[PDB]
Amino acid sequence: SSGARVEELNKLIQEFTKHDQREYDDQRALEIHTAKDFIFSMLGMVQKLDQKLPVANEYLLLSGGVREGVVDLDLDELNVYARGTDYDMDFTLLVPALKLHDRNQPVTLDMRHSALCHSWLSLRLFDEGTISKWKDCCTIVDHINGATNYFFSPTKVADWFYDSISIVLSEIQKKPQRGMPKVEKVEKNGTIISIILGVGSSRMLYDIVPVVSFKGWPAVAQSWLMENHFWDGKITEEEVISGFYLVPACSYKGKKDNEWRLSFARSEVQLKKCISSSLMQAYQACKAIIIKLLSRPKAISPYHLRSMMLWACDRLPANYLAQEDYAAHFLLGLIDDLQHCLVNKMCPNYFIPQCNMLEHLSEETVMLHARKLSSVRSDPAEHLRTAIEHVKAANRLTLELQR
């Protein structure tokens, strides 16, 4: 009976959730806060070194690392960090290097050489102090006629952001080490700076990302404001559409030195309050299954799976999403969606639906993942049973170091 197959997945999804959820005691909670406090003070000292970072800055801390697909970043060409082996808890931190207003969108966002969901950032119309403050981090474009333009470069900013962190941390290393978190690793992986801190028994991974902060909602995502979504009535619209980000990632066509990617990372944090726990549990189970065998050569990012999980919140009324016994049906629905998107090489962005997030995949690689997915679809409980063992093994690796 197919009802017996549903109960088996419901049991495995519930068992997977038991070992996947992070529960910290009072000791681990202080170890995490001490590491976060050191990161925040480090960024404060980075602002004191070069007066480039804003004096009044607002960071965005997320519970997962970049390689876990928490933000729309290009996960390819990123070295792999294993939980329990290299870190015990992972985090990503968006550090705004610039703060702009809603009125500054049509005059600073240059999207004439960029695909959808991407843009250049023109600093031409800023005051002379800001232009001179970021002149070394911009792509200067001189013209025979017309004003010289300054495009905020994601590459130059990342190198400066990494050098500033390296300088601040190197000075702290000279002074005696008492009460300071032992820095396990400092690496510049593309436009991402990864720091592993050792505070007590646990190790913390922080993927710090240099970001451009914007106030208001993107003009290219205007249509997303014109339909009633699932969060309508459960959370206030002001908390969702109050701002967006520019993440240092380019499209497969754009210029790596000039192009940013629009990120709705803080809109999704507010939307997580409305997503049902059952659909969320199936998402975490589906993520632990596919990202293993669907990562090479061109990985399908967990953010691609997060978008489909978000798409499933609107196309689907709250009734079927509410009942907890339908967790197996949610996991299979995400697998069927991950099949349809691969077959047509089409995965629309949840906030900018006309943006295809799979246009960078070749026809060969997307067919290979579709054949690998058919083996997962035919036996979803077995791939989930293996994913539970990978989480239990990582939970004992972290515990062995804490013990």
Residue numbers in the entry: 28 to 430
Question: What did the authors write?
Answer:
Cyclic GMP–AMP synthase (cGAS) is a cytosolic DNA sensor that produces the second messenger cG[2′–5′]pA[3′–5′]p (2′3′-cGAMP) and controls activation of innate immunity in mammalian cells. Here we show that cGAS-like receptors (cGLRs) are innate immune sensors that are capable of recognizing divergent molecular patterns and catalysing synthesis of distinct nucleotide second messenger signals. In support of this conclusion, Hartmann, Imler, Cai and colleagues have identified cGLR2 as a second functional cGLR in Drosophila and have demonstrated in vivo that cGLR1 and cGLR2 have discrete roles in Drosophila immunity. Together, our results define cGLRs as receptors in animal cells that are capable of detecting diverse pathogen-associated molecular patterns and dictating response to the foreign environment.
To define the function of cGAS-like enzymes in animals, we screened predicted cGAS homologues for suitability in structural analysis and determined a 2.4 Å crystal structure of the human protein MB21D2 (hMB21D2; encoded by C3orf59) and a 1.6 Å crystal structure of a protein from the beetle species Tribolium castaneum (GenBank XP_969398.1). Despite divergence in the primary sequence, the hMB21D2 and T. castaneum XP_969398.1 structures each reveal close homology to human cGAS with a shared bi-lobed architecture, a caged nucleotidyltransferase core, a Gly-[Gly/Ser] activation loop and a putative catalytic triad. A conserved groove is present in both the hMB21D2 and the T. castaneum XP_969398.1 structures, but is notably distinguished by the absence of a Zn-ribbon and the insertion of a C-terminal α-helix in hMB21D2. We hypothesized that the remodelling of this groove controls the detection of distinct ligands. The hMB21D2 surface is overall neutral with no obvious capacity to bind nucleic acids, and no enzymatic activity was detected with a panel of potential activating ligands. Our structural analysis also reveals that the human cGLR MB21D2 is competent for synthesis of nucleotide second messengers and has a remodelled ligand-binding groove that is probably adapted for detection of an unknown stimulus. Together with the known high frequency of hMB21D2 mutations in cancer, these results support a more extensive role for cGLR signalling in human biology.
